[model samples]
Target: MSVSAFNRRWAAVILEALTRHGVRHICIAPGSRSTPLTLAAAENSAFIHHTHFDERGLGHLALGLAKVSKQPVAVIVTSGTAVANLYPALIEAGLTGEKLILLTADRPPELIDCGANQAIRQPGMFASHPTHSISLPRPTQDIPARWLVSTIDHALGTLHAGGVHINCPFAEPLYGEMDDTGLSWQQRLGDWWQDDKPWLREAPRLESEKQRDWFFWRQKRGVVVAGRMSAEEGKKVALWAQTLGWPLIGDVLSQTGQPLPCADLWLGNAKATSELQQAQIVVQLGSSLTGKRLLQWQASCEPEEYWIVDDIEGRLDPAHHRGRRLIANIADWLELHPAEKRQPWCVEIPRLAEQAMQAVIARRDAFGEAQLAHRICDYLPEQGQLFVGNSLVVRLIDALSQLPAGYPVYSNRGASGIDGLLSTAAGVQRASGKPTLAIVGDLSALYDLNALALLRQVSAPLVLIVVNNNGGQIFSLLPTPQSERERFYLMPQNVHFEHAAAMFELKYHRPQNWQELETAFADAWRTPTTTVIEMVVNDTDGAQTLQQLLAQVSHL
Candidate 1:
């Protein structure tokens, strides 16, 4: 019985490199080809490991963890279909700039052409999504161990964020070789094990920018539009708005700007929206704004100026509307700007925004889906996450929900697909170790049904509320005939979620009326177990309700 020094040495150095490079967790999906890396990860007490059976959910689970944990997560998977499963989440990661490191274990050179099972073209499989990718050769003593060590060092060094793919080929009896692979193999990483530093990250500089632009923009009658960012980051977005005496038109995802949650309501109100749109400048901070009213305003606003502070080099403005786009971190720019308060220029917009919020209160005074969206947040733990689904839930929350501080709102608006929502919410809970709620549509829940299995595995309390109006009511809201919608678009399922909840062993509650919903929601919040509460309404009635509601505030 001999330990494969080759397999053991390569895996040890790989784990060490990722560990030193600020990866605190490795989300692993089991398979034979990936044994060396998985075993190495499990053995090392330094890096915590998570196991998921489904690689699709596992990829998104890592996305959720990385999103909230604010750290890079490496996903270890075997070759073939498992590697293909990571794609959906990787698309989200690259768009949102979440750090997801991919470790794909595969068959070596001899096995590739010989019709070995579970072997495919592993390198470049992810297409253009990965930020950087490299293929590593078969583990062998003939190749210097430092070749693997130096290659990983360079890969991690070149990477700042987004998806980094390492396609590994190993000729193996997979899981043997527990014995240490001699000091010489791993000795290539001398002092790296003992070092307290965070690898070769460039030293921070003040990164001063010319203030002429800020000075000029400060003089205009400006309105601040905060888009998707972390809660603290958005608060500073609010800070700059308040400091410069601008009205903050914040989106739900930004987690700040909740003070004027009804900004979306002003979309159609000619007097209210047009007045705000007349703003000389609209400075949008963050990205993925979920409100049509805001997009309408952004589109309608004249070419006075449209400035965007997008993440990295991302193009937040799709219309090429930005007069200037600054590729700088939001928190850094806000602190460094040192904006001074002045006589409120667009104080009118805040007054107009307040009037709209009052209309929202009066409009949503009844019990409907909008009211339901608001109530979900009302029952949440004081300091927990709030995530809404892609199509309608995020838009509804953006229009109606009141987000208090200490609660960060989240959406996978990077690619913003309906898949993996439950798993993402589960990952957020794992990250914060606090209670979290995911309000999604029936279709979205159905899309990620398997993700519900992840609920029992994590400790954080999760309350999933499915707004089952049978099918896609969002499509119904627009000018589409009911007959056409039912026939072509809205696949209204005459189904419920009780069985899904039962299958997953999650507590199930289907609320009949207002009182029942209140009780079920309260119970879910009060408990630590996972709960699924489906709030049903008529598919035809939903579109009517929203139209009637929007019409109520149109005269304002």
Candidate 2:
């Protein structure tokens, strides 16, 4: 068979295999080398296709689609920088356990290192981060059909745990006309054997007897930490925690609703303080925590048992702290644990937490940053995922969003860079398959405009609520605020993100007052595509709000 014949034959085989594995969405980033792959994918209308100009955003677009759909979403990108652009999302997926299928188009190894255009050593670029990485052979007549089956099987298997990266190298004849022969092509394509190896893996459920014993022993001191979760997942966690008398330290992202009356504690900070040390056992759920103090506190104490509960199992404690992996759903495990009213020790800490929350709310307006933070958190939807951008936006959410017992929350606090805010949100949305809300600053929003391009492909709605103070207001609150004030400290930008929404044809709204903001938020949530809502607050007033918030927390 000629090269065209082989590509045509293998393309059908690959598409059929993907369909069999239940991949419903494929995000495409335009590039010359990927023409053949894109054509093949588009030809099969069973798979939904979404296109984006920016490769980085395209990766995130696929992630968001997968998250909402609860199915494997594939991203097709051309060789070179395009593949590298996906690294951030890949890293986030690995850490958060998002199931993404990265399909990278590449030139054959012979062309690599020979100064070939858009060519780089593309194989295994994400080996460190991906659950599995595979390089598909160049299409050839002599290749056995079994090899193709095995490759597809491996990719699908890896996706069970997290994400997979597949690199394909194609030769010169990138695009060509499909044969117009009237004979049915469907029959020939359908003949490929449906490999069941990838689809038949056993689900990872904890040994029931062992789990029951563990629950019985740890019930009294057990405390559940709900990170960023969907509203529904947060509710489940809250109900489970209530039953077990486990204090839930939740953030805004968890969306479990107002702290359950039965919840023992409602601390928002991730850092471990005096209270977290009291728990003999801790159960961590979802991806991340907002309070750095909580993480620090956890690092300090030597808990008797730290069981991290999540759907994706591996090392729950990425920081290598004190958590042991508990591969079971929090809700299911709660059934085994059973509810019991705890002693005064657990109850006392939770009461103090309630006081701390009250204190922050009362004096939040005293400081500009704190006020802004509290307002942002207060205004966010009760359910759905919240992706906080770095700096003030993150700190504000940390201080304000009192995640009820079960809400799930997340942030890129690991590296804490503003570079991939939108991309990360998109990834989280894809992984979780939930409505996503991103709280970003004006500067962060402007810096990540490319991410907006992905909205066209996102399956679920993404509500972007930007705290537009015109620049990096977080710098003003830092220690070096005096000397770095003008030039580098408060790096100001005059860009209007409404124009950005227009450029991308996304839904745009600007709220000038509190009521307007509320109305805009409601409308944005209801909008189907990516919606950007700009809240223009005076920089000077925002600074004042931060001061008041600090003073309140200081007394606590």
Candidate 3:
């Protein structure tokens, strides 16, 4: 108890500081060294604790919480491979700028380089992922308590809103003893503990010293491409678009509800659509384009004044047509530089867009998997977030009608992969307690099947609507020959998720048609349990709907 007392108090003070910093959710992966962190987090009501048996799942669970809550979510794990397991989600948080706080417990100094069990080189392990990393020495009276608190304070202030990793090494008897030791945090904190406030509060930061003149740029025929952004941030983008009278090509992940209905059809073929080809300026807010057509259009159009007004320092404009780059928050910048509403800037858009919407509704009127995505947009709760899987599904939603404005959407587009879709969605629903949905593809659903286990603890009703199109259906759209396509590309699974739903205690619905889908989706929201809504579609038809839509649009 004598030796453990210092680490115990150290852990307790850390948790108190985290609470004051407004970090509410803590995801824990069981490990021996991390016992102190887990115990401290469990006792505090200010922290909402989530647990996972798998370290990989645990990291993503925290990722989801951070995505939905717009705050730094903490993940605690024990030493060795446990910390290594986090690399995937760490890379994700790094690339996407998702705020994550990783408190990884490690073996004490003497254990390493001596073949000590569960002890390995833990420091500098996350590589370049974490915004800040520290190999914190074992808690001791030799080090002042203020240094620990200050370390957290400084680490919390990130250059970009990303991950902070603190490698905490602990000695024997990780959890049992509870006594105030190690230079007295109470005495060290002084009167700071009397108030419920962090030692430091982070501020919204901007890089540049001067403001860019929107007075000249606002009048230019423009359009806003709201990529991956927060619902609040999306709202500001939508407002800015409306004020500037510009068509917004809001990506599904942008969560900016109610973007132009036919952006996929209209913007995808800029030369085919009017005013789109004659773009004087394009304002890229947040991040990259979701659809290829939009991606290609910007590449070719080469607008006279292409601009990226985002605080995130990602390589968003891969096309290399940047006329200006402003490092500032989308909302803050727009609020200061308000634009007068400029209507009829793209007058021919509405007519062509109407035709495109009609085409979508008519095509999506059937009860197939493709149409399920189109219909899901209309059926989701008027305002909660809808997290879509990468590849076909996200593009499907984008290729169809977008939100009418404010309904948030998300996709793990940064290093976009099929894994962790379910776990991430589970985190979103659990943290927000919102009526959330994860619209996933077959392979994606199969990839994270274990994430279904998390459904039991979810307080909010989350529906998993999986669109199974046999195997790698999206591969067929790539001009590959059919025989080899099935042989080499698609990993076709001829299974349904009824048993998977049953195994997890989630209500199962195998909707045969659109009517049943609507009813099942409604009931899913009414019930507290997670629901698995399976929609079966074509097995090898890659981007078939959009490709066909593009073909049809060209004829029109």
Q: TM-score of every model?
A: 0.93, 0.83, 0.93
Q: Rate the local accuracy (lDDT) of all candidates.
A: 0.77, 0.65, 0.77
Residue pairs that clash (backbone atoms under 3 angstroms), model 1: none
Question: Lowest-lDDT window of 10 residues in candidate 2?
Answer: 260-269
lDDT tens digits by residue: candidate 2, 1-28: 2454446556655665677667878888
Mind giving the per-residue lDDT tens digits that candidate 3 earns over 279-340? Answer: 78888887856777777776776678787877777556888885777777777767766778
Alpha-carbon deviation at 223 in model 3, angstroms? 2.6
Candidate 1, residues 277-362, lDDT tens digits: the string is 55788778888878877787787777588888755555678777748777667887776565677777554456656676666666
* Cα lDDT for residue 159, candidate 1: 64
TM-score of 3: 0.93
Model 2 has an lDDT value of 0.65
Clashes of each: 0, 43, 7
lDDT of 1 at 298: 80
